[PDB]
Amino acid sequence: MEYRRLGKSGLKVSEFSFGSWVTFGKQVDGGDAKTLMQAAYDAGINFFDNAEGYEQGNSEALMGAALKELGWDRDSYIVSSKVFWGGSKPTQKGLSRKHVTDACNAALKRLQVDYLDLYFCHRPDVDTPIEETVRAMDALITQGKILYWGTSEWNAQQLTEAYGVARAYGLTPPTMEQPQYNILERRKVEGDFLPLYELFGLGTTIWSPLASGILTGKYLEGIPNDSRLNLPGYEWLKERWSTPDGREKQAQVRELADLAKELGISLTHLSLLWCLANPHVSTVILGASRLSQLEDNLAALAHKDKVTPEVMARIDEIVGNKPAGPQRF
């Protein structure tokens, strides 16, 4: 395992991290959470991602119980929560000072920690001034309840606004953003966010590096019975991939699988290493519903030399989705 700075910050994250979306509290019960988390930790993963919205708090409860039982040195790992979806009522969601503060205190108790290393705004809230959210985060910094704060799937206008508010009012700037990023989804990391890396030093913990599992190639011939897209409650996700746009992407996945075979690598490994080939990626957050998948994904790290500039160019040619850079006149 190698480690990268989270943007310009001094926090060093393992290049692969481990998250809990979908799996914790359903596919992954309390005992399996402990097993997966210890396996990740023994492999050198030092960042574990969660959110208040994940199974309505139960993912964080399970992760906190695992953390307590496993007894890791607190200085040896990084844990997050993310605030946005904390219930159905108007004060239980969004990024108001009230819900940012309530959700932080609630996450501390669920995760059974005294502080969060990382605390993300899970989505942007167009109904709360970004200034208010930044002020709420700054109070949590000064109280010692969080160390770094950031955002997820914000746009570059919103992020630039947050940095400007922090500077104007003497508040703590954000550190980091958590965007989806994979061969099939590149718009924010390689497009919208491009100027923010040099301007602000924005770090990235990227989400869904296998496109919910599409980039394993496991769906090329149909839908496995034991697969995310077949889970009850995720019919919306099966639907998105059944659209014509989702079907064209799946046809490109077949070409990517042929490229991987040509290289002597699984498509899973190619897709994870592709993310790491971007120097603006601080960490790739892995997802796994079972130990064998975590082990498989960790094995990708042995094949870095197979992912060359020539391979990156061929992937660009297959998918055709490399975002345009800054425009000149």
Residue 297 near ligand NAP by CB under 6 A:
yes
Residue 212 near ligand NAP by CB under 6 A:
yes
CB closer to ligand NAP, 198 vs 295: 295
Neighbours of 278 (CB within 10 A): 16
**H-helix or E-strand spanning residue 151:** strand 146-151
Residue 176 near ligand NAP by CB under 6 A:
no
Residue 151 near ligand NAP by CB under 6 A:
no
Residue 20 near ligand NAP by CB under 6 A:
yes
3-state per-residue secondary structure call for 12-50: EEECEEEECCCCECCCECHHHHHHHHHHHHHCCCCEEEC
CB closer to ligand NAP, 134 vs 272: 272
Establish whether 303 is an annotated binding residue.
no
As to burial, measured by CB atoms within 10 angstroms (0-12 exposed, 13-18 middle, 19+ buried), residue 63 is buried
Residue 46 near ligand NAP by CB under 6 A:
no
**H-helix or E-strand spanning residue 148:** strand 146-151
CB closer to ligand NAP, 19 vs 86: 19
Residue 21 near ligand NAP by CB under 6 A:
yes
- Catalytic position from the list 41, 54, 119, 181: 54
Residue 175 near ligand NAP by CB under 6 A:
no
Residue 130 structure tokens: 């970004």
**In angstroms, what is the minimal distance from the CB of 13 to ligand NAP?**
13
Residue 49 near ligand NAP by CB under 6 A:
yes
Report in angstroms the alpha-carbon separations of 299 from 1, 40, 217, 293, 304.
Answer: 10, 12, 17, 10, 10
Give the range of 31-39, 56-64, 251-259, 291-299 binding ligand NAP by CB under 6 A: 291-299
Task: Write down the residue that tokens 């940095």 correspond to.
Answer: 163
Coil, strand or helix at 249: helix
Residue 75 structure tokens: 């200085």
- 54 catalytic? Reply is yes
**% helix / strand / coil in the chain, to the nearest 5?**
50, 15, 35
Coil, strand or helix at 207: strand
Give the range of 95-103, 204-212, 244-252, 256-264 binding ligand NAP by CB under 6 A: 204-212
Residue 249 near ligand NAP by CB under 6 A:
no
Size of the site for ligand NAP (CB under 6 A): 31
Residue 61: partners with Cβ closer than 8 Å, 6 or more residues away: 110
The crossing angle, in degrees rounded to 10, of helices 58-70 and 97-111 is: 40
The one among 133, 208, 282, 283 contacting ligand NAP by CB under 6 A: 208
Residue 210 near ligand NAP by CB under 6 A:
yes
Residue 7 near ligand NAP by CB under 6 A:
no
For ligand NAP, the binding residues (CB under 6 A) are 19-23, 27, 49, 122, 152-153, 178, 180, 207-213, 216, 218, 227-228, 268, 285, 287-289, 293, 296-297
Catalytic positions? 54
Give the residue numbers of the binding site for NADP(+). 20-21, 27, 49, 122-123, 208, 210, 212, 218, 228, 289, 293, 296-297
